[model samples]
Target chain A: TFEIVFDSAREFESLIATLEKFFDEAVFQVNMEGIQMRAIDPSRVVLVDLNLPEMLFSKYSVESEEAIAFDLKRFLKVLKLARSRDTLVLRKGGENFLEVGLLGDENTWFKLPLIDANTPEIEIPSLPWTVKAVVLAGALKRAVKAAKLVSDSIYFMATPEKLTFKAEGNDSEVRTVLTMEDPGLLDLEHKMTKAKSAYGVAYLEDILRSLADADEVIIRFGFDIPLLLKYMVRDAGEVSFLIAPR
Target chain B: TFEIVFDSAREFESLIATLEKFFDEAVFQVNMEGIQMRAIDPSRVVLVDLNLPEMLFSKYSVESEEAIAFDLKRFLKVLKLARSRDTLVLRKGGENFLEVGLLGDENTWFKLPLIDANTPEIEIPSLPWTVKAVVLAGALKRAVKAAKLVSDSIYFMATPEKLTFKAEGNDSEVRTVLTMEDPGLLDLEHKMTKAKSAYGVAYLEDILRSLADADEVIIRFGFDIPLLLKYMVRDAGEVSFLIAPRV
Candidate 1:
């Protein structure tokens, strides 16, 4: 038996809102430590890693390790009705259904049918990241949108002093530069002299748009390796994504 | 030559936002009095009457009465960009285009090509309306949405004591009652003992949803008569819609 209660439903809703964009179904592994999920997009171009420590929840009890699979589309439908102030409770006592209770002005409970989703173990690769930059999520979001207007892919070039995002079309181009002194650029580190990579703007835009409330985004990449974006979900947990370079 | 300037573009934007839903193209008859537009939906079940007095505009000038046709869909596209603080200027000096200017921190203008549209005179029938009610727009909007959940048509029954909106579906029903004492019900008048009529909720919902910012809605109807909804566009103008009752 495993049951967890969140002080508010907002963080849980935000977590599902972003995960559902990349995955149709997700497998949540529950244990005394925390709830963890790792899934790759069908196109195999992006991978999502999520970790919610047990301490993030107000009440968490697990007799043993458990793995539960849920249809994200259906799960999000119920979560959408939750208010920001509502207390969310997730209970898995029965084998067939997972009971989700939203305690607010009006108490609502949804019984989601458990599915036999194919769960596979995924291991994160430890690559030699050449450049790491921490930037404002809002600024990055705007730059992605500006890039999309000119081209399908965005180039990220990082130097010790500054970072540059550039997109070029046949007749048009857009470039946004953020120096170390720029207010949007919180931190910048470059292992080598300079590193550059290109990524599909579509996936990056969707990911950034979903994290509207996230204050900062940690960006890490190499010359041609995949791009890694880490977002802290308030004080609760962390969500990270790795997108293969175009 | 005709030119008009509105201190703020919000009122003009709201007018076009609502009109475009019913009209693909509209003919604006501009004169010294203001702009007058009367058009009916393609289904001919609803008629829209609009009147914007010259006093509504910050500047109004006219050499003669002119009838200019515009594609509302294209017109609304430009108006949607207007901000609340932006000043709107409409000028028609050339025979081919109507120049619309949105003056804000940054000035932007759009030249809409004038096209020939079918313009017909519509005469509103004056009937003896037995029941009249003035209610808060927000309350009416909520009731309309609530009715839509249960059925496709909503019945409005007005008595001397109260007014009721009711909808009945196959197994579900919704009823909302408003008495004179209710704060949402500003005024109520029933000349006869009682009056009841039904209207298609789809049309009513669309009309009400567009007037999201309106404060009050004046409703007038009689037994088996067309329902009339009058909404004041701030202090600038008035927009009214008449929908034929469902038999």
Candidate 2:
């Protein structure tokens, strides 16, 4: 049996919203440490790994490690009703249900039935990354939006001093460049002379939309290899995604 | 040739948005005084009368009185692109188009084709309204929304000291009451002991949504008579709507 409370439900709601975009149902592992989830999209084009430590919750208690599975799309619908000031409480309801409560000026309770799902064990592969860049979430979001207006895919090119995003279509093209000296570019590291890769603009846009509250995003990639976008959840935990190159 | 410039395009955009809800095409009369439009919906259940004076525009000049017709729905699409700080400039383009320009950090222009539409002259009818109440726009907007959730029509009843809105659905009913002492009720006048009428909720909701920027809305009605909603556009002009009640 495990029960947890969050000071504000917005944090959990946002995470679930992003997860539902790539998954219909997800299996979350809960233990003394916190909650963790790792899953890859059915098309095998993207992978999401999420971690929420105990420190992130206002109140947390667990008797034993448990794997809870539920429909993400349905779970998000309840979470979306939470106000910014409402406190969210989650605990085991019975043998096959989870009780979700929102405590505000008015209290509301929802009973979600647990689903029997098979947890897929995914092995993280270590790749030799040629470039690592930290950029402002807002800036990167705007660049992705601008690129989407021109093409379905966007190219990311990085060197020792700068990062460039470009997209071209039949009659229009967009380009955005951020140098080390720019305020939006926080840090840059290069193991090689240069690195370039392309990814679907729609996938990147969806990922960035969910990270609007994040301050900065760490991007790691190499020449035509997979892309890693990582967001640190304050000092509590982290959420990251890996998108295969086009 | 006529050219007009507004300090902020949002004012024009919002008016067009409201007009498009009731009209697909509208005939605008522009003169040295300002612009005016009067039209009724196809169903003839509602009539909209709008007047914008020259004082509302930063720069307004007209060579003569002209009747220009255009597709309001299409015109509103271009107006929706205006930012808060953008200035809107409208002028006659040749003999068949209206030139719209948005002046901001980046200027954009769109040429809207003019339609040769026949202007319908509507005569206003005077009615003996026994009740007139001035209420806050925001407060009335909320009441209309609450009523819409329960039914397609809302009943408005007024007494000497209070006004009430009620809607009944299949299994649910919602009612809201505002006394003369309430802050949202600015003024109340009644000629009889009690007056009551019912109007379509959808029509009221659309009218209120467009008048989101208005401070107060004056409501006038009587027993089963037509309803009148008048909104004053600051010191420039006014926009009013008349809706017939259901049997």
Candidate 3:
């Protein structure tokens, strides 16, 4: 049985929600270096690459480095038992079970059955990216919400001077224009060649909902390429999501 | 034809939700003095009397004293078009319609048709009360939530020294006791006779949900009689509910 403790329950909850967006169950490969998972969505349009360094946890020890298949959705719900400020502990139960224990004013515990998901690992594809821009996660979330009311597809257009997100419907439209000089855009690296792509707004909105804790998100995409989103993990880790464009 | 305005749309929304708990369609007798509605639930166990004084509204005018029937549920839904901070305007549309206008960052309006609810009004009966206590609305709300977990009926017991609310279920129980001297209870007055009554926890909880804006609530009841819950209106006025106990 293995046991791991986290400094804050909120961080652990955010980590699970981000992973469950593209996968229901995942096999996490854990070792002394850290833990990581590579998963692909059912439609094969999204590829998730998650990495959590050992320093992210207060205490982490495993008898052996192994791949553990877990029900990520159920695990996320179990974390709800703990308060944001509470400390969480994950312990391996007797054969095919994981015990989630929350420690706070009132101690609570949840037990879930681990299974052999039989899902194969995904290989990260290397893409030739032409532009990368870093923007506030909060701002993007608001823009996604506004755009959803207008259209199913939102366009991401990047120019040398500004980056714009636009969505148009039959009767209404929403557009968020952020110039390179805008405070919301933390950084921008682009070529003189203006790039643009249209993506399904629903999927992008789903990912934005779980990024409340993220300070900034780095976006990289070109014409007809999969959009890449990179954000920092809890303490010493990183997460990247790749969604294919229309 | 009538036209009125409310200071806070949130207060009007709260008022409608509380009234909808008891009846679907309500007949309001609006006159120059103000507007009032008296209704009883389908089960005939709860009586709701809402009084909104003319002073409560910035503008209150009526061509004549008329009894108009409005769908309580539909009226509450119209209020949703307005935000909490928005100012709400209620006007009598061209015969048999109520126009609701919301003013804030964006102006919005809705019109609902009024029907002829044939139900007559009930006379407000006088009750001989032996005990009265004023307590914080928040304190009572928390007690109702805890009691609902255990039992269908919660008992209100008051002694010369303290007041207590208790409920018991099949396996669990919850009790919230507030001494007469406790800060939560603003004031307590009782005769030598101690009073005890039981009420449906669900009804009490529904009423509490709408009373968040009320700082303090006045409770009055006698042994084996109906319990009375009284709270203030938004700017000016009062709303009260009389819940009958089991015979």
Top-scoring candidate (lDDT)? 2
DockQ of each candidate's interface versus the true one? 0.03, 0.04, 0.03
The true-structure Cα RMSD of candidate 3 reads 9.7
> Which CAPRI quality tier does the interface of model 1 achieve?
incorrect
How far out, in Å, is residue A166 in model 2?
Answer: 21
Predicted candidate 2 versus true structure: per-residue lDDT over B49-92, tens digit per residue: 88999998889999977889998886787677676797999888
What are the runs in model 3 whose C-alpha is more than 4 Å off?
A: A1-246, B170-173
lDDT per residue for candidate 1 within A1-246, as digits (tens), equals 888998878767767887888888899998799999998998899999999998888899888787899888777766766656479889888566777776653344456677785888999999778998889988898789999999999999888888889999779999999997778899988789888889999998778865763378999998888999988865668899999996
Clashes per candidate (backbone, < 3 Å): 0, 0, 0
Q: List, residue by residue over B1-247, the lDDT tens digit for candidate 1.
A: 8889998887677778777878799899988899989999989878899898999888999888888898999989898898879999999885789999999989999999998856877888788899999988766775676566567988888988878887776644556678866666889999988798889888887787766633788999988888999988766688899988886
Error of 2 at B26 (Å): 1.6
TM-score of each prediction = 0.54, 0.54, 0.53
Candidates' C-alpha lDDT: 0.83, 0.84, 0.78
- Candidate 2 retains true contacts at a fraction of 0.00
DockQ of 1: 0.03
Query: Once model 3 is optimally superposed onto the true structure by TM-score, how far is the C-alpha of residue B142 displaced, in angstroms?
Result: 2.6
Q: What overall lDDT, based on C-alpha atoms, would model 3 receive against the true structure?
A: 0.78
